[PDB]
């Protein structure tokens, strides 16, 4: 349906500037996941380090080294006690933040995959979920350090994962131009969505838990629901050729924060299907867009070692 | 700023520590390895002092080399290479004796054809335009035996020449050094390797010094 969404009054052109200039990184940034308290964020460097930055005071607290030099992604626990790290060595290390007699100590090393950890997420303190590069976005535990559920059904490899506030379901897009909605309870795939040509770089999730948006490398975004089984809205641009590499939603869901490879980002409207604002100011292409739970900050993780909060 | 002073001091301390770690890491040059299956990897990683990728580090002539052997990667090359910006050079290990054999994947393409396709793929990407390639040629004695037993006319139909080893090695030196679009920013250093001729680290040392010098000159426009 595209006729009922044309009667809403347009929000207009919105322009937002940077707030903090998180300087200190000397390598590339691939994933900067945001916490739940809307205050701390985690940033994955590329040389050897993983820094949990602060947003208000803009002062680092833990810049912990890693056994793996390459860190593909990162995840911050909803409780703020553990962090998950990606990489290519198939070691999703879980560092303990709030530890006794020390700053930060590693708890368990998650091994048993053959691809590469592309996008880790945390359902709760213990039950966590990863997304490897060998088409195994299996679920993990911290106490035993072994998998409990394995998700299969993607032809190619998967490189994106997003959770739900209900924590019971989660959608994840693979490089075969398909996003599958897995269920944590049964472990099977509810539905695989089709309609995009290029691979799904990164995927987001709607705040209510009834829709999502996928990031395709074909300069096209889509708003796919969970109970409609059909693409509702699409966002395409003519004067660009690169594709989105990270999509995120705000606290309301109208502002779709998309990140292209034009060394900038964009804010789409989920109802008017028009580019509201262009967020420029990055020397390199953006790699991740982290929006808070209350829409208080929109951080970007471009490869220029600069994290800019556009709020 | 009253009670947060300790927080800012700890932030500055860990920032100095991170800067020291980054300066120490930049002192260690990073190299990746590519090639076909069993193309002479053990012969070069066992002479140094030293699922997922392998990362080794060894010191030679007051210089730290960080070798990254991808080896077996279940995921596609388009992903982990796409996120490998900031490397000085790459290494391409091949065996010239793998021209009369056919890989057990399609039974229709030659191993040299697959190596040339991999080279054209890694040389025509938007991430390795300013990155150099060092070609390692493993088991040159096996290649000599094969070229003394096989005339090479079955692998390359357009090739024409006599039956020897020097001109074949020269043709190989001119076969993998022309697939790139330009040679000013895509310099290639080829070297042979076999059971003999130990301590071949001097070649890769000279190559990495040359490529980092050329990079530093291109930074300031001196090249």
């Amino acid at each position: 349906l595209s006729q009922i969404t044309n009667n809403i009054d347009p929000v207009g052109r919105i322009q937002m500037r940077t707030r903090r200039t998180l300087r200190g990184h000397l390598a590339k940034i691939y994933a900067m996941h945001w916490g739940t308290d809307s205050r701390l964020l985690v940033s994955a460097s590329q040389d050897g380090k993983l820094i949990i930055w602060d947003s208000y005071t803009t002062n680092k607290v833990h810049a912990i080294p890693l056994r793996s030099s390459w860190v593909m992604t990162c995840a911050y626990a909803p409780s703020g006690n553990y962090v998950a790290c990606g990489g290519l060595d198939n070691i999703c290390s879980i560092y303990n933040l709030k530890t006794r007699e020390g700053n930060v100590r590693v708890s368990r090393e998650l091994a048993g995959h053959t691809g590469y950890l592309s996008c880790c997420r945390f359902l709760d303190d213990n039950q966590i979920v990863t997304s490897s590069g060998d088409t195994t976005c299996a679920l993990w535990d911290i106490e035993t350090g072994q998998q409990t559920t394995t998700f299969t059904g993607h032809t190619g490899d998967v490189m994106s994962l997003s959770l739900a506030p209900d924590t019971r379901l989660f959608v994840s897009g693979a490089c075969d131009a398909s996003a599958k909605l897995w269920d944590v309870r049964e472990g099977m795939c509810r539905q695989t969505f089709t309609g995009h040509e290029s691979d799904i770089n990164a995927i987001c999730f709607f705040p209510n838990g009834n829709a999502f948006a996928t990031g395709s490398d074909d300069a096209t975004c889509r708003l796919f629901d969970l109970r409609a089984d059909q693409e509702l809205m699409t966002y395409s641009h003519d004067n660009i050729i690169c594709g989105i590499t990270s999509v995120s939603f705000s606290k309301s869901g109208r502002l779709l924060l998309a990140g292209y490879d034009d060394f900038n980002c964009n804010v789409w409207d989920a109802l008017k299907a028009d580019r509201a604002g262009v967020l420029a100011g990055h020397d390199n292409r953006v790699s991740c867009l982290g929006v808070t739970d209350d829409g208080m900050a929109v951080a970007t993780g471009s490869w220029d070692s600069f994290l800019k909060i556009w709020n | 700023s009253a009670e947060d002073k300790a927080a800012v001091e700890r932030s500055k301390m860990i920032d100095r520590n991170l800067r020291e770690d980054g300066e120490k890491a930049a002192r260690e040059v990073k190299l990746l390895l590519l090639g076909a299956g069993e193309s002479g990897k053990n012969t070069i990683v066992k002479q140094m002092k030293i699922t997922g990728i392998v990362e080794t580090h060894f010191t030679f002539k007051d210089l730290h080399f960080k070798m990254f052997d991808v080896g077996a990667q279940r995921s596609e090359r388009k992903k982990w290479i796409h996120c490998f910006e900031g490397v000085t050079a790459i290494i391409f290990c091949v065996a010239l004796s793998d021209y009369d054999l056919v890989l057990a994947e399609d039974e229709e393409m030659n191993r040299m054809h697959a190596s040339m396709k991999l080279f054209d793929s890694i040389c025509n990407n938007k991430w390795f335009t300013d990155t150099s390639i060092i070609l390692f040629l493993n088991k040159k004695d096996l290649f000599e035996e094969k070229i003394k037993k096989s005339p090479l006319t079955i692998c390359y139909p357009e090739y024409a020449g006599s039956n020897t080893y020097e001109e074949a090695a020269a043709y190989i030196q001119c076969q993998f050094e022309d697939l790139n679009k330009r040679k000013d920013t895509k310099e290639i250093y080829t070297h042979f390797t076999c059971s003999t001729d130990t301590k071949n680290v001097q070649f890769v040392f000279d190559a990495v010094t040359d490529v980092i010098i050329k990079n530093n000159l291109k930074d300031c426009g001196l090249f």
Partner: single-chain antibody
Amino acid sequence: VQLVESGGGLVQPGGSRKLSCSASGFAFSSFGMHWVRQAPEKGLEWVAYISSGSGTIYYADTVKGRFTISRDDPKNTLFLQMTSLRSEDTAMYYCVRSIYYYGSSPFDFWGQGTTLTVSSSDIVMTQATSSVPVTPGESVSISCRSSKSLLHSNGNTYLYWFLQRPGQSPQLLIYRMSNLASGVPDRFSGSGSGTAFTLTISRLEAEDVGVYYCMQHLEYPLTFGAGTKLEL
């Protein structure tokens, strides 16, 4: 993990001795240390503080220019030089660690310390009570006042609570007056305005005979006060 002190005994006013606090089991290079002493008749008083990693120095008003403290991370020790000693310094010196960041738990673990005997701008805060009989299991509500408004620009108060059990180190009870620390049950509830503070304790347990002390970290001077003791 451990904090063991040694070098005590009988000293003369104006002499010289070497005191250290040996600690091992944590990152000593990323933890600031204090030297809060405890007199048998006077409440605790902070004297000196070093930042994490031999950084800044913090002193008191009556000690600036008299004492000198150094640290050694490779040796993991604390070098203290006690010169110009007076006859009124009988106290229990501690070697307490602390770390300060967003959501940190400062003054989490306190040392043991050794005793010693001898022969013959500033922020001050008063208390409410001195020693009242409290029965175990009555949901005790302890109150406290201050001489300043805890309305810092960051948006949170700075009030830490401590208790010294007989023969047990003065461990931490609650930090920032609204967030429970590690090692305490889920029974303490701290609240109040910027001037006055209150702390409710429901479902009390045994061995609750320690004295309560308060601490503010708005400025360099750290004053604990007299002390509100609890009876049986």
